[PDB]
Design an enzyme around this catalytic site. Structure first.
Site, short mmCIF file in Angstrom:
data_model
loop_
_atom_site.label_atom_id
_atom_site.label_comp_id
_atom_site.label_asym_id
_atom_site.label_seq_id
_atom_site.Cartn_x
_atom_site.Cartn_y
_atom_site.Cartn_z
CG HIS A 17 35.55 43.21 47.15
ND1 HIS A 17 36.58 42.41 46.71
CD2 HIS A 17 35.79 44.45 46.64
CE1 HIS A 17 37.39 43.12 45.95
NE2 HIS A 17 36.95 44.37 45.91
NE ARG B 78 37.02 49.48 41.34
CZ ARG B 78 37.10 49.61 40.02
NH1 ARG B 78 36.20 50.33 39.34
NH2 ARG B 78 38.09 49.01 39.37
CD1 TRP C 41 33.24 39.67 45.85
CD2 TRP C 41 32.41 41.67 45.27
NE1 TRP C 41 34.18 40.30 45.07
CE2 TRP C 41 33.70 41.53 44.70
CE3 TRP C 41 31.68 42.86 45.04
CZ2 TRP C 41 34.28 42.53 43.91
CZ3 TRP C 41 32.27 43.85 44.25
CH2 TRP C 41 33.56 43.68 43.70
CG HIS D 18 40.94 52.17 42.38
ND1 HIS D 18 40.84 51.76 41.06
CD2 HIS D 18 40.87 51.05 43.13
CE1 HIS D 18 40.70 50.45 41.03
NE2 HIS D 18 40.72 49.99 42.27
C1 HEM Z 1 43.47 42.51 45.90
C2 HEM Z 1 42.88 43.70 46.03
C3 HEM Z 1 41.64 44.13 45.21
C4 HEM Z 1 41.32 43.78 43.94
C5 HEM Z 1 42.09 42.84 42.99
C6 HEM Z 1 40.07 44.43 43.60
C7 HEM Z 1 39.41 44.32 42.40
C8 HEM Z 1 38.16 44.82 42.10
C9 HEM Z 1 37.46 44.69 40.83
C10 HEM Z 1 37.98 43.95 39.57
C11 HEM Z 1 36.28 45.32 40.96
C12 HEM Z 1 35.17 45.48 39.90
C13 HEM Z 1 35.31 46.76 39.09
C14 HEM Z 1 34.09 46.82 38.19
O1 HEM Z 1 33.99 45.99 37.25
O2 HEM Z 1 33.21 47.67 38.43
C15 HEM Z 1 36.21 45.88 42.28
C16 HEM Z 1 35.14 46.59 42.78
C17 HEM Z 1 35.05 47.20 44.01
N1 HEM Z 1 36.08 47.31 44.93
FE1 HEM Z 1 37.78 46.05 44.89
N2 HEM Z 1 39.66 45.18 44.69
C18 HEM Z 1 40.60 45.03 45.68
C19 HEM Z 1 40.54 45.65 46.91
C20 HEM Z 1 39.59 46.56 47.33
C21 HEM Z 1 39.68 47.41 48.51
C22 HEM Z 1 40.92 47.42 49.45
C23 HEM Z 1 38.55 48.15 48.59
C24 HEM Z 1 38.18 49.23 49.64
C25 HEM Z 1 38.42 49.13 50.95
C26 HEM Z 1 37.71 47.79 47.45
C27 HEM Z 1 36.46 48.29 47.16
C28 HEM Z 1 35.66 47.99 46.07
C29 HEM Z 1 34.26 48.35 45.91
C30 HEM Z 1 33.34 49.10 46.90
C31 HEM Z 1 33.86 47.81 44.55
C32 HEM Z 1 32.48 47.91 43.87
C33 HEM Z 1 32.53 49.14 42.96
C34 HEM Z 1 31.22 49.34 42.23
O3 HEM Z 1 30.22 48.63 42.52
O4 HEM Z 1 31.17 50.25 41.36
N3 HEM Z 1 38.39 46.83 46.72
N4 HEM Z 1 37.37 45.56 42.96
N1 LIG Z 2 41.90 47.07 42.47
N2 LIG Z 2 41.96 46.49 41.35
C1 LIG Z 2 41.00 46.63 40.43
O1 LIG Z 2 40.01 47.33 40.62
C2 LIG Z 2 41.07 45.89 39.11
C3 LIG Z 2 41.61 44.60 39.02
C4 LIG Z 2 41.63 43.95 37.79
N3 LIG Z 2 41.13 44.54 36.68
C5 LIG Z 2 40.61 45.78 36.74
C6 LIG Z 2 40.55 46.49 37.95
#
Ligand code: HEM
Ligand SMILES: N=NC(=O)c1ccncc1
EC number: 1.11.1.5
Length: 291
Positions: free
Chosen positions: A172, A45, A188, A49
């Site tokens: 995810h 992540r 997920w 980001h």
């Molecule tokens: C529409 C696009 C995306 C949205 C809205 C989104 C949103 C989110 C949100 C809300 C979380 C949870 C944050 C938390 O509460 O810890 C998350 C976690 C995460 N995201 Fe996404 N994300 C998107 C795309 C992506 C992409 C493109 C990747 C990497 C290729 C990614 C990788 C991850 C990973 C690995 C986590 C877990 C992080 C953890 O367990 O600490 N995401 N994402």
């Molecule tokens: N990539 N988007 C996010 O991680 C995110 C989306 C919505 N709220 C907090 C974080």
């Protein structure tokens, strides 16, 4: 803006494999973090980001500058919780102070994916730290509470097409949402620190119910104890996304190959590589090295 990759002075493949190894060894060592998920998902992540601020229109943001180290960006509400990834990488940076911040953040992601049994991700060095005034403003990362049209349009800014979007979202499979961080709660899937095509299988096979979580936000929940963001679920609501989800749910190798390309592209957006830059590096895992 033009950002030209410049190899850290005198460094070669062997130097970066050493940095990979230190990250990988620490991933193995610090196994208690986040209820024994470990730091793998948060590192992925973090790479996403730090890269996902890029704007193709003017080449602002992106992985090149390593700007997450500056207050404006590390305090982005969208980045809540990523301080854990940064803290993990701190002793790595101390041991290898020669590596740029952008190179370290992006390599952290590559290392996590590979160590969690994901595809090989070729990686190129040469990102160069840029000053504090180059830090992109908050609000360039995507909202979770939106639909497929939003997702499609959003990712056009990062020069990603439908296939690239769906492939990238398969990350995810990793980690979970944390209520206090993002206002969503739950994983997920089941195998939170193993890189697989489980995201797509779960989307298609689970019985999802649209519910409100304790932060008063809607998310899709299954009886297995899994969740999907509105943006995740949009991938099966949109007919074009749906076809690609089905493709990846039924072909692990194809998903691996497409994710690898998309993830390298994400990490490399905004960077000009000189004609005589080294080729991309493909690092050996600890397992492959017998370490
Ligand atoms: C529409 C696009 C995306 C949205 C809205 C989104 C949103 C989110 C949100 C809300 C979380 C949870 C944050 C938390 O509460 O810890 C998350 C976690 C995460 N995201 Fe996404 N994300 C998107 C795309 C992506 C992409 C493109 C990747 C990497 C290729 C990614 C990788 C991850 C990973 C690995 C986590 C877990 C992080 C953890 O367990 O600490 N995401 N994402
Ligand atoms: N990539 N988007 C996010 O991680 C995110 C989306 C919505 N709220 C907090 C974080």
């Amino acid at each position: 803006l033009v950002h030209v990759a410049s190899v850290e002075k005198g460094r070669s493949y062997e130097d970066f494999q050493k940095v990979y190894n230190a990250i990988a060894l620490k991933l193995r060592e610090d196994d208690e973090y986040d209820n024994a998920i470990g730091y793998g998902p948060v590192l992925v992540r973090l790479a996403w980001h730090t890269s996902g601020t890029w704007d193709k229109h003017d080449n602002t943001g992106g992985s090149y500058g390593g700007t997450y180290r500056f207050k404006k960006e590390f305090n982005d509400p969208s980045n809540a919780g990523l301080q854990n990834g940064f803290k993990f990488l701190e002793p790595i940076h101390k041991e290898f102070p020669w590596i740029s911040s952008g190179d370290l953040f992006s390599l952290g992601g590559v290392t996590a994916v590979q160590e969690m049994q994901g595809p090989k991700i070729p990686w190129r060095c040469g990102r160069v730290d840029t000053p504090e005034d180059t830090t992109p403003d908050n609000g360039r990362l995507p909202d979770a509470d939106k639909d497929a049209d939003y997702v499609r349009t959003f990712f056009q800014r990062l020069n990603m097409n439908d296939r690239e979007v769906v492939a990238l979202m398969g990350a995810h499979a990793l980690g979970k949402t944390h209520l206090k961080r993002s206002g969503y709660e739950g994983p997920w899937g089941a195998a939170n620190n193993v890189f697989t095509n489980e995201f797509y299988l779960n989307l298609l096979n689970e019985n999802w119910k649209l519910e409100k979580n304790d932060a008063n936000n809607e998310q899709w929940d299954s009886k297995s104890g899994y969740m999907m963001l509105p943006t995740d679920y949009s991938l099966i609501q949109d007919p074009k996304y749906l076809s690609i989800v089905k493709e990846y749910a039924n072909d692990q190798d194809k998903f691996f190959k497409d994710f690898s390309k998309a993830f390298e592209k994400l990490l490399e957006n905004g960077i000009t590589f000189p004609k005589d830059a080294p080729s991309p590096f493909i690092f050996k895992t600890l397992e492959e090295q017998g370490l």
